[PDB]
Symmetry: C2
Subunit: 349 residues, 2 copies
């Protein structure tokens, strides 16, 4: 036809991406690993390798200037961690109103024949560098008429994204330390205690007619119990901390896109003030300076729609992150207590 | 007044005909309320120390519970360890019937207090003279069998002294971990949660205060859990250390007593060997064997009683510790559940 046109609509939070009219989701599952991808809109599953993921990712970066594109996991439990984060990546892709409609993404998810695969790759390599469309569905209010008010919005988001990048990094660092603290210090303390309870028991077995075999076994049971709890601490991060880190990792990449995204838009804001001022001196034509203004305005709404979409996904993802972490901790400490109440019952006899 | 009788586990102290208990309260003067006394009695630590030094001079073959140190949690831990000391005293068949101990509990006067004090000072029967107080069994046990029993207890007491020291060391380290390490990690986690929430408040119209409040609630929760860990040793670890301290004092009483017994067995074989060679009068060699038989009975009774209390106190120790650990991790789980509902719905 002509070109794809992404729409920006007004909403409760202000400018937002109009939803994908043809929504879908995609599951990721299983010396070359070919991940089995099953999108909702396809009749047959699709097998793609990280190499193919990396191809698409590079295509996305060159295509979308104002949109934050989710980062892939490292190129180099690495295998398991990769799949968890490819899933998180995929979900963020499918739930993004613009990224989910990208033709290169569609070719990535639908193409079966390998002969058509090569063609569809080169076909997506000539678009981009075509930048964007961004039609605006609503009518421009009197509040958004000043690009100054829009630029002030961008500045507050920059400062926000800076401290969020700090808090996320700090939390991700703390979590990774807890993992080692769980495999190390936590396990060690419970195992020194259990080893001590075993030492007490062994000493109590050195006088056969004057010692109770029941008590000596109970204390010995508590010894093995605490030594088993130590192993529970060591095996716990895989249930709660790992998934939290995966979530934080997703937002490391999203937040890392913003510095450049914001830099571009502030450059457009300066180009507007420059073009207009130059048009006031007489060294610039007015209608050309008008085109700069109106274009900067439209992509300003796009950015506003993206920051809006970021907050929307953030609130969903962080809610589920805290919930999932706490539910597991609750389970973990419940399991701990049951071990203790199991070994306490040994002393009833 | 004292007697040693045979039993299922062998030689043992005859039970106190008039058993009792004594509560210790802190209204420094301690409020002591003997259950068999008509009126409560107030005593300071110096009074305990006086009584303690009387027991050392009096009962040589008996293992006397050590008094807590004379020189934070100090002065509070003394109250706990004086209770354990008192309980061991009133539950000992010999020590509980001691006249000076009864004077220490049932003297509500003051002039009579100084009098009874002197009464215990100039006691004719002490040490080796105390051995003529209690009567032994009429049964005859092989002297070699007794020595083997003592030697078995010697090996046991040494290994237990180590295992107790091991657990005592581990527990003391656990107290510091609770105040330091365990608290710190929770404090770090909640602090990070706090920062996340704070950073979420930097873009006011676009961020949910409901979510930020829940996140910062979880932060204050994990910080609260940190302080719970810091306060926890007072509920379980402190009590366990008090029990181990009690038995470290008891196990230290034995080496000297055992050594005296080993010397008693030695002089029996010694005197008899030379009595046969005509180097000593047999009647005097008999008096040595007789003396060894008596002290051997007293030691077996003490070793039996030590085991009797050991299995009780350690059963209760392990029970009290576990029960408090259980309650602790339940209270933690409640803190976590309380903060999870903040994310509803």
């Amino acid at each position: 036809y002509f070109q794809s046109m992404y729409s920006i609509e007004m909403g409760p939070r202000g400018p937002q991406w109009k939803a994908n009219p043809h929504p879908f989701a995609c599951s990721v599952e299983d010396s070359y690993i070919s991940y089995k991808l099953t999108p909702t809109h396809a009749a047959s599953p699709v097998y793609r390798r990280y190499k193919h993921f990396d191809w698409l990712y590079n295509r996305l970066l060159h295509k979308f200037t104002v949109i934050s594109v989710p980062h892939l996991p490292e190129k180099q439990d690495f295998i398991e961690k990769r799949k968890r984060r490819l899933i998180l990546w995929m979900d963020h892709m499918t739930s993004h109103p613009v990224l989910s409609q990208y033709e290169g993404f569609q070719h990535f998810l639908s193409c079966l024949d390998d002969k058509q695969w090569k063609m569809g790759k080169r076909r997506a390599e000539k678009d981009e560098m075509v930048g964007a469309s961004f039609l605006l569905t609503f009518q421009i209010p009197t509040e958004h008429q000043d690009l100054q008010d829009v630029e002030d919005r961008v500045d507050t988001f920059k400062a926000f994204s800076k401290k969020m990048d700090d808090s996320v990094l700090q939390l991700s660092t703390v979590a990774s330390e807890l993992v080692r603290k769980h495999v190390g210090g936590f396990r060690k303390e419970f195992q020194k205690l259990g080893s001590a309870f075993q030492a007490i028991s062994h000493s109590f077995q050195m006088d056969p007619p004057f010692c109770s075999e029941a008590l000596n076994s109970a204390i010995s049971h508590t010894g093995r119990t605490y030594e088993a709890i130590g192993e529970m601490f060591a095996e716990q991060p895989k249930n709660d901390l790992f998934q939290m880190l995966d979530t934080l990792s997703l937002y490391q990449g999203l937040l890392s896109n913003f510095p450049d995204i914001i830099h571009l838009q502030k450059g457009a804001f300066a180009k507007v003030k420059e073009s207009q001022r130059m048009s006031d001196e007489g060294r610039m034509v007015q209608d050309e300076a008008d085109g700069i203004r109106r274009r900067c305005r439209v992509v300003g709404f796009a950015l506003q729609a993206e920051m809006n979409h970021f907050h929307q996904r953030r609130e969903l993802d962080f809610k589920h992150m805290m919930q999932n972490y706490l539910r597991q901790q609750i389970l973990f400490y419940q399991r701990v207590g049951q071990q203790l109440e199991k070994t306490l019952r040994m002393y009833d006899n």
